[PDB]
């Protein structure tokens, strides 16, 4: 009775980073070995746990967060980072115990002329506390004048689109990201390996 990791990694559609998706994994047997022998994951780093000791440890819950960002932005999915994505879209805590997996997806996420469907949040009054999710679409007041929900000067729609063309540099190419949070609580563990 395996865990539905195919649903998370092999899905046809990924969410945009401002509306990052969370799948709860529980009451199943997770085999993490498929990571090591994948040889097709550009980014694979784990924090607060050993990468190879995953099959030996159990957890009460596992949380898979998934979204799409640019290549040179993948470095922002890590504890104590700053930038557009880490400040306004997806913030990992300092005490983060989990892993971050990412891979190039230019072939199925870009399109000739550009794929403008994947969005990211560009403006926010404050920063995101860890694992916060902001999907509000209120016009951001960047100036000293009221907007009253009307776009124009100093009044910007808080979400901007990604310009994913197949002929971009790898930094400006779409990258799919999965963030596995391992949760340990005073409760029966429900996600193990062998």
């Amino acid at each position, epitope marked *: 009775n395996l865990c539905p990791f195919g649903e998370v990694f092999n899905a046809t559609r990924f969410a945009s980073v401002y509306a990052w998706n969370r799948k709860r994994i529980s009451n199943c047997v997770a085999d993490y070995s498929f990571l090591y022998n994948s040889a097709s994951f550009s980014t694979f780093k784990c924090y607060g746990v050993s990468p190879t000791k995953l099959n030996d440890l159990c957890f009460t819950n596992v949380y898979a967060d998934s979204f799409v960002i640019r290549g040179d932005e993948v470095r922002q999915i890590a504890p104590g980072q700053t930038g557009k994505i880490a400040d306004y879209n997806y913030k990992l805590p300092d005490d983060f115990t989990g892993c971050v997996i990412a891979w190039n997806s230019n072939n199925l996420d870009s399109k000739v002329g550009g794929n403008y469907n994947y969005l990211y949040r*560009l403006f926010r009054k404050s920063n995101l506390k860890p694992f916060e999710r902001d999907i509000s679409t209120e016009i951001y007041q960047a*100036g*000293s*004048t*009221p907007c009253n929900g*009307v*776009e124009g*000067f100093n*009044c910007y729609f808080p979400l901007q689109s990604y310009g994913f063309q197949p002929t971009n540099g790898v930094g400006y190419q779409p990258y799919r990201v999965v963030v596995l949070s391992f949760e340990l609580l005073h409760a029966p563990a429900t996600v193990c390996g062998p």
Partner: antibody, heavy 123, light 108 residues
Framework: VQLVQSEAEVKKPGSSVKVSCKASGGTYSSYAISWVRQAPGQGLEWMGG????????NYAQKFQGRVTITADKSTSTAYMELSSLRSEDTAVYYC?????????????????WGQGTLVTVSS | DIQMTQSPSSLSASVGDRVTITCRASQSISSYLNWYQQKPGKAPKLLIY???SLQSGVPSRFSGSGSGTDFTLTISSLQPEDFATYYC?????????FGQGTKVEIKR
């Protein structure tokens, strides 16, 4: 010169026109570029704008669905495309520039205007 | 949509006169009011940008005053290169709107 615009255009009604505006110098330097038109013997009318350093564009409600303003940092040139043209669109289109006014934390005045591009729409 | 109405529409003055142009907004816009000068055939040049702040390179004889709904551009000791059309424009609310203009013509 500080701002140069493309030459005049003559278009039949229903066609589309795309005007260019090059900022003299190397880059945009966080300026904002707006487009304002003036019909013969009329006043000035804002249509839309773009912030190249940020990659954002806004448009007036009177021109929603018809205008698209873009920018190329490589050539340091802004473009404004107006489609589904009408006789009323015949006017002089100025490309103007706005500096970030730190005292009010935004763009609040046009400090430099281009010479203007005449667009004539007629049967 | 704030309507900016200027007064007067036309004005006749001679060199060395004190000229005042009033600009009224349909609703309060604080001090987010700008004054532009335009001559026939050429592009507009900025004169005043904070209801009262002088744009660098403009003679001191130009001064803006006013706040809320009433504003005034005053030019003391009109000079020959000052005969032109003057527009006021508000930046408080989108969309930004201009006035219909005031033409300052030579009196003879």
């Amino acid at each position: 010169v500080q701002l140069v615009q493309s030459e005049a255009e003559v278009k039949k009604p229903g066609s589309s026109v795309k005007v260019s505006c090059k900022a003299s110098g190397g880059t945009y330097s966080s300026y904002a570029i707006s487009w304002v038109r003036q019909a013969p013997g009329q006043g000035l009318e804002w249509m839309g704008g773009i912030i190249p350093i940020l990659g954002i564009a806004n448009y007036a409600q009177k021109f929603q669905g018809r205008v698209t303003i873009t920018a190329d940092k490589s050539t340091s040139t802004a473009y404004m495309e107006l489609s589904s043209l009408r006789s009323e669109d015949t006017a002089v289109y100025y490309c103007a520039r706005l500096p970030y006014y730190y005292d009010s934390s935004g763009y609040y005045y046009f400090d430099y205007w281009g010479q203007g591009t005449l667009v004539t729409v007629s049967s | 949509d704030i309507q900016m109405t200027q007064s007067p529409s036309s004005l006749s003055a001679s060199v060395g006169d004190r000229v005042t142009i009033t600009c009224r907004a349909s609703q309060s816009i604080s001090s987010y009011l700008n004054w532009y000068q335009q001559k026939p055939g050429k592009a507009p040049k900025l004169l005043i940008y904070a209801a009262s702040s002088l744009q660098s390179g403009v003679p001191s004889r130009f001064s803006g005053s006013g706040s809320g709904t009433d504003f005034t551009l005053t030019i003391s000791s009109l000079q020959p290169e000052d005969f032109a059309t003057y527009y006021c424009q508000q930046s408080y609310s989108n969309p930004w709107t201009f006035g219909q203009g005031t033409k300052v013509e030579i009196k003879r």
